[PDB]
Amino acid sequence: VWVVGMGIVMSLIVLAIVFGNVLVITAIAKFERLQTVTNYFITSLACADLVMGLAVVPFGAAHILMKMWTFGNFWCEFWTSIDVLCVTASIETLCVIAVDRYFAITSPFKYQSLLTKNKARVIILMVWIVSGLTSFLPIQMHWYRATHQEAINCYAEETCCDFFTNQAYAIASSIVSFYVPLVIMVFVYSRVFQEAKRQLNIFEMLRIDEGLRLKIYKDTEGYYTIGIGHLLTKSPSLNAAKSELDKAIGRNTNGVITKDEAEKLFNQDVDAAVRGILRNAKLKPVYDSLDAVRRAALINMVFQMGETGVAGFTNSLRMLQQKRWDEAAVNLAKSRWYNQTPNRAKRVITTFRTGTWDAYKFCLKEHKALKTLGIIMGTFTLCWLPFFIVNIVHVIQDNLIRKEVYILLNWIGYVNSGFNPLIYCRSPDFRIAFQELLCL
Ligand SMILES: CC(C)CCC[C@@H](C)[C@H]1CC[C@H]2[C@@H]3CC=C4C[C@@H](O)CC[C@]4(C)[C@H]3CC[C@]12C
Ligand SMILES: CC(C)CCC[C@@H](C)[C@H]1CC[C@H]2[C@@H]3CC=C4C[C@@H](O)CC[C@]4(C)[C@H]3CC[C@]12C
Ligand SMILES: Nc1nc(Nc2ccccc2)nc2ccc(Br)cc12
Ligand SMILES: C=CCc1ccccc1OC[C@@H](O)CNC(C)C
Numbered sequence: 001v002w003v004v005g006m007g008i009v010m011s012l013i014v015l016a017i018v019f020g021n022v023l024v025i026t027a028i029a030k031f032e033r034l035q036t037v038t039n040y041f042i043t044s045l046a047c048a049d050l051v052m053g054l055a056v057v058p059f060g061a062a063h064i065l066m067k068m069w070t071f072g073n074f075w076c077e078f079w080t081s082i083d084v085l086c087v088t089a090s091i092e093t094l095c096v097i098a099v100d101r102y103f104a105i106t107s108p109f110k111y112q113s114l115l116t117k118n119k120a121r122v123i124i125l126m127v128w129i130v131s132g133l134t135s136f137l138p139i140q141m142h143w144y145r146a147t148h149q150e151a152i153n154c155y156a157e158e159t160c161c162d163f164f165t166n167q168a169y170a171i172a173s174s175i176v177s178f179y180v181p182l183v184i185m186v187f188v189y190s191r192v193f194q195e196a197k198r199q200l201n202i203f204e205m206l207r208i209d210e211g212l213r214l215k216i217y218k219d220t221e222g223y224y225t226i227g228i229g230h231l232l233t234k235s236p237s238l239n240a241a242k243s244e245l246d247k248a249i250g251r252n253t254n255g256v257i258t259k260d261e262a263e264k265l266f267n268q269d270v271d272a273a274v275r276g277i278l279r280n281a282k283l284k285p286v287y288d289s290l291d292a293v294r295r296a297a298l299i300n301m302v303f304q305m306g307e308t309g310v311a312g313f314t315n316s317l318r319m320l321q322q323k324r325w326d327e328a329a330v331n332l333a334k335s336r337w338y339n340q341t342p343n344r345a346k347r348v349i350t351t352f353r354t355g356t357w358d359a360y361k362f363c364l365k366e367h368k369a370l371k372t373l374g375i376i377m378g379t380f381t382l383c384w385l386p387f388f389i390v391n392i393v394h395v396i397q398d399n400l401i402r403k404e405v406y407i408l409l410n411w412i413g414y415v416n417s418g419f420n421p422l423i424y425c426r427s428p429d430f431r432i433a434f435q436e437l438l439c440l
Contacts, residue, residue, distance in 0.1 A: 003065050010061040013415060017053030020421030021046040027433035034429055037113035037120045038373070041097045042424075044124045045376075048090040049417035056083045057414050064407070069161035076161035077139055085128075085135040087384065087413070088177040092127045094377050095181040098189035101370060105195045111366040134177055144169040162403070167395045178388050185377055193374065196367050200357040202270060202296040206303055208363045209344045214262065216241055216255040220341055226255070227262040229303070230269055273299050276307040283311055289321040297351035304344070305337065320352060329353035368427075375423050383416040 024046040028039045059079050063069055069076055103114050115123065138144055144165040145155060151164035165173070210229035216238070219225045224232040224241035232241035242255050249261055277283045277298065287298055298320075301310045311317070313335065319328035329349050332338065338345035347359035362371045387409040394401040424430040 007061070007065055010057070010064075013418060014053050014057050014061070016418035017049060017057060020418055021050040021053065023434060023437060024421050024424055024430070025050065026437055027430060030437075031433050034433055035117075037115055037117060038097060038100065038369075040117065040120050040124065041093055041100065042420075044127065045090060045093045045097075046420060048086045048093065049420055051082060052086045052414065052417040055079070056086060057417070060411075060414070063161060068159045070159075071161075073155075073158050073161075076158075079161070080163055081136045081139040084139065084173070084177070085131055086417075088135050089128055089131040090380065090416075091178055091181040091185065091384075092131060093124075094380055095185045095188075096123060096127060097373055098185045098192065098377065101192045101373065102188050102195075105192050105199070105370075110199070111369075131177075134173075138169060138173065144173075170391055170395050174388050174391055178384065182381065182385075186381070189374060189377060192370060196370060197357055197361065200293075200296075200360060202299045203266070204364050205296050205300060205351075205357075205360060206266070206270070208360055209300075209347055210303070212259075212262065214257055214259065216245070226257065226265075228266040228269075230262075230265045269303060270299065273302040277302055280307045280311055282314075282317060283307065286317045286321045289323070291355060293355050293357065294320065294352050297348045300348050300351075301337075304341075325353050325355065372423060372427055375426070376420055379419050379423065380416055383419070384413045387413050 025043055028034045028043050056079065059071060059075070060083075062071075071079070100113050100115060104110070104112055107114060113120070145151070146164045146166045148164075151162075154160035154162045154164060207228055212228050213226065216224055216226045216232065219229065219231070223234050224238065226232055226241075226245060233244050235241070238255075242253070245255065245257070246252050248265065249257060251261075277287045283298070283302070287295060290298060298310075313331065316328045316331045316335075319325075319331070329352055332345070332349045332352065335345075338349065347363075350359040351357070362368055390401065390406070390409055394406075425434065
């Protein structure tokens, strides 16, 4: 019959869950630079998805294909109990991630978790402990058992593992175990995206569109530069750029420098840009007649071109001081600066034009890491929220739920366990880690 199709489909889903989440787990286990605090949370998140694929989805596939329960009422309890455990531990983990990323993005240690690894391990156990209590106890203590005849006949029957619960459980379980951490997750992590966008200074602005290299390279004009767009010299001699590099650093570098002494150059360059805007009489009044977002966009222009080069935009300077943003943005486009480097000028002109950071959304490496964590959360919501909204309406509407429409929406939740590894292939560090494990 037509069951052979779903068997292959479900068997592939079990593989994509197991093979993908063991891949995520092993990548964090062996590789050091992925052993971060956030990735310990992802480890337990992958475990919740891995156990979903080893203990839950297969026995649910045998339940659908055989149209009955082969494994007894004992395993019917654990299968249900472990299924609830993996979903409860997943949302709280995603809830801990969001709160961890909030306290990180608000501390002066931006993008770095305040929790230590030993303490984050203490959090993981409590999540599984609290999940293990809210999941096993209501199922093992029969607090879910309904009192209507159809449920009672399935309870005593060992070949039936239909999941009928009384209305009190369906409410309290959905609220405490799913909706509360969901609402916290969505509110706390929307608070993170709002801080990353609000907390964009000139330093992150430049470091995005200027880049960072630790080896001497030629810039867009061909001049020897190093660090974050630090101009070394305009002479074609490499040692002239290396000797000027050593005079500025004080160390014999042979053209290679660390990230610490590269930020120190980056600070001095930005300081020279602000001091240069204040020395020049043509740039001083315009800088003062600007908000912090456009002050940065101005510091960026002086960073790239110098004080005298930026002062040539005599019309654009008068308009940015007259606060005529759209009109200044046009003369900024009619320049040869927008010709040589259009992608950078676009982001700077739009920063003047709009007075926001929309041109630099998710352009910084650490913001892309947050957007990655926002996708595993938004996916977790879209996979389970339909299931949980139908449970909450099923109870209120008082009509019993359609067994195929019910189990359907639970499988949209099941296929969530295979989505996390692909969203991690959207990180550059996991791609490099996965390719080693796959030996590609
Ligand atoms: C099958 C079900 C019922 C039991 C599985 C739950 C337990 C054994 C598993 C699932 C996820 C696991 C955690 C995943 C994250 C790691 C981080 C690592 O640095 C230390 C151990 C720690 C913190 C694990 C401890 C044990 C753990 C909580
Ligand atoms: C009934 C069946 C499904 C229960 C078996 C649950 C299995 C999958 C659980 C139980 C304990 C878990 C492990 C606990 C220790 C951690 C160490 C961490 O650095 C990598 C993941 C790893 C190794 C976990 C992987 C998943 C794990 C092995
Ligand atoms: N499911 C639940 N998760 C979590 N995690 C969490 C951890 C740190 C900060 C915020 C939230 N908290 C809950 C508080 C009450 C109730 Br009720 C349920 C939860
Ligand atoms: C109304 C209970 C639904 C629920 C609440 C909390 C955690 C998980 C929940 O349901 C997960 C489903 O995957 C289980 N459905 C059965 C076990 C097939």
